[PDB]
Design a protein around this nucleic acid. Sequence first.
RNA 1: GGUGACCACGGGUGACGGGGAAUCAGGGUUCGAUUCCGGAGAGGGAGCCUGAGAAACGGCUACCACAUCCAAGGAAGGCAGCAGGCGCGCAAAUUACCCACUCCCGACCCGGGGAGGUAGUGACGAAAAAUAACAAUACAGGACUCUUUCGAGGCCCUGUAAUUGGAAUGAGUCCACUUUAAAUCCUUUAACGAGGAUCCAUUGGAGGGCAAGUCUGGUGCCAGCAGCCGCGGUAAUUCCAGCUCCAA
Lengths: 125, 141, 185, 131, 58
Amino acid sequence: QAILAARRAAAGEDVETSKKWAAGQNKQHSITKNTAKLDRETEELHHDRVTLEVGKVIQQGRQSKGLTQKDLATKINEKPQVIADYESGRAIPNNQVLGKIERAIGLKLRGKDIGKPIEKGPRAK
Amino acid sequence: GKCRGLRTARKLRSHRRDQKWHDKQYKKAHLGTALKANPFGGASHAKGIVLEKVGVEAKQPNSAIRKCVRVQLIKNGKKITAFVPNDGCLNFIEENDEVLVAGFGRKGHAVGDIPGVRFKVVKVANVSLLALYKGKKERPR
Amino acid sequence: PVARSWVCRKTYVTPRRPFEKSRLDQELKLIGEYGLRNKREVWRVKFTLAKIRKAARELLTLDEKDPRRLFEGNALLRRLVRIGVLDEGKMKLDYILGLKIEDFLERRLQTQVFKLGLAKSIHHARVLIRQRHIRVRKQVVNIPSFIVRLDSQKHIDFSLRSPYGGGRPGRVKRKNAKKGQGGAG
Amino acid sequence: NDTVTIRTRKFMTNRLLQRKQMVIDVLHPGKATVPKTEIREKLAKMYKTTPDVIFVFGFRTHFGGGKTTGFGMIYDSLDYAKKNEPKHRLARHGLYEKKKTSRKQRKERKNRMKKVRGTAKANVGAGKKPK
Amino acid sequence: VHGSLARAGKVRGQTPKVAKQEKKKKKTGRAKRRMQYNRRFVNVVPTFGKKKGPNANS
RNA sequence: GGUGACCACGGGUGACGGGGAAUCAGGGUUCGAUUCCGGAGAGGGAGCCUGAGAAACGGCUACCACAUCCAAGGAAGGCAGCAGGCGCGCAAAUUACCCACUCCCGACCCGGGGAGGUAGUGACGAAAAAUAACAAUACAGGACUCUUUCGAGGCCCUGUAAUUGGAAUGAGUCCACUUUAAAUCCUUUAACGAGGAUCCAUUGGAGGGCAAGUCUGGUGCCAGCAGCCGCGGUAAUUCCAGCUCCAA
Ligand SMILES: [Mg+2]
Ligand SMILES: [Mg+2]
Ligand SMILES: [Mg+2]
Ligand SMILES: [Mg+2]
Ligand SMILES: [Mg+2]
Ligand SMILES: [Mg+2]
Ligand SMILES: [Mg+2]
């Protein structure tokens, strides 16, 4: 991005380092929500859940690879139950969970397009 | 209080060297008898020959058995029991072979749930126990 | 029975208290924004700073008018200004205590080549230093921790043998050039 | 030869060692280490001397190529050079022969002739049969 | 001996055998010191999260 | 008679002494068998000849203790010298070359020197410092963000990170030169030599101290972990595995 280029150009002087949320921890499943607006939020009262179309995608996914719920659960490093729910359709969808499911499965259930014949291209383009 | 003359260094030194003994560490270091009581004779590791594989239970709040082994030393061949810390190394070791038993880690004193053992087994016949466990190097059958 | 020296010492000091967040982040910023290999370099440079601070502290605790105090203070000042870590206008010993590590890191040739703009991307500058493509006033030096002296700051130029001073292009140049001359004519 | 030059420094004259001692440094910008013989030739031609009484060794290069420094040895006569000069250099450019058995065979021979006493015939006969 | 030593390494016997799959060789040296610094210091995520990880799965 | 509580005497010392080494607010505490100096010994005692200098030991004699050959009649030993063996042990290198250097010894330019020097072994230890960089490609994925989708950057995640994509390279074969007593190495230096540049960094951790996992799958007070608190009988943040982070 431009600012890093300028900071390189700022070899003479200036420049500040500020860290991040990050730098050291490990947490192993991601809240997709900001957790701050939800605190500020009182008006809206609904959570979208996941579309069952995605559940069909996961099911045909597993079948075409021929893995049971438990095997894909071991793969994505999460419980069998979260998989079973995500197929069932409740799933309270989490971006990183379905993202790892996307990395495992050939289809790209992640993203606006429901599916991709290959996720992000074969051997990644 | 304590002596504070200027022409008195002898008294202070003699009293300090008297009171110097009353701590365990210096006494066991300088008496000599502790060195003789140490089976290793002050060495860090020791060669020993395996006599029998023993299982000793741990303390009460823990519930397990522990695979240790009574090992005969080569120098001053008294018998001591040395623990083998790992999942299945007890099967790796057989009877009647050399082992470089080293200290447990806390200066001739029992460790953890284990009662009465101050020695851990490493370097069985020349291949190192860790290399067997990881499969880095195998038994010389 | 032996004509050897045995004269050696550690060039660095380990940290006393391992695993403190603040020091870890401090050294991490220093290395990363300074493009060092491992924090042994940071420890060594801070050790040099500590030694000079120790000497300066002893000198200050010594009374003024001492011929040894005056002589050593002047020597320390002159060698610092010769290094460049000291401004010519600040010849006072207490000012040496106020000095910090980062400017001592600036005098590293790896940093100075990037500052001159001769080798961009300070990591690339250091990799080029290891690629010995630079040439000091009369020599080609491959030492990232090299400290420049004031006279030599302007004496930093690319080596003639590198494909950046004189000619003699590299081996990938030779390979792909012969490849092109063998594929076209 | 196109771009290779020789410079000399700390150059002093002497007569009791019938020579001149100086330290020489050679520049070869894009060249390997220079063999000694043509350095001998260059110094002979630039000192108006024969290219045979000049001895040179101890050549090491400053880091990065180019500069290479060493010790130069010019005498006045190979005669007086032969009188006062270490032998192994004469071994390098062959003028002085050097071919003997190693010190081990030398020592065992010495102990053998030490074993026998007095008799010259057997003492020199300790090298004839016991070889 | 009580013979209850038959269980030594039992869990090592019962663990399934899964291996180390191929993965791109991580850089070392100053290269290794580079990218985690890049990932830890100059990076401003626009989301909250009460100062989560660089392995961030919050 | 002499000494002695101002510790005599006696006993131990895993005691050769000192210069110094390690630690470092200061103060002190430990270590100095070992290259410098002094002393002592050359298996354990004991006595000698010559010699200026020896109670000498790569000198002699006796005893003890080992221990070689022996036609059994005698003869010859001293590696706490260089190596190098055995033994001993956790623990310690090559039975290599050279007098070229340092100096020594001798009748002496000219000989000798396991002194010593060189090389070999050598993660004792210390210094320096490889394991990748540059630029663009850009493209996607995000509660992204800034207008309310469209556009951009004040951001994150991985991935073509890919023809990138050609530039510079060392690690290694490897020209000679150099070096050297002769070699060896380093330094020069051609010819080669890198895109998973697969030419591959590991060792220990990831509950607290203490940096890092309310991951998953196994195991089920079992195995085991654990410097210490403690963990482990079905849902283990502590074991065994994969993934990922931390440490140097
Ligand atoms: Mg000592
Ligand atoms: Mg001495
Ligand atoms: Mg005499
Ligand atoms: Mg004697
Ligand atoms: Mg004697
Ligand atoms: Mg590497
Ligand atoms: Mg972990």
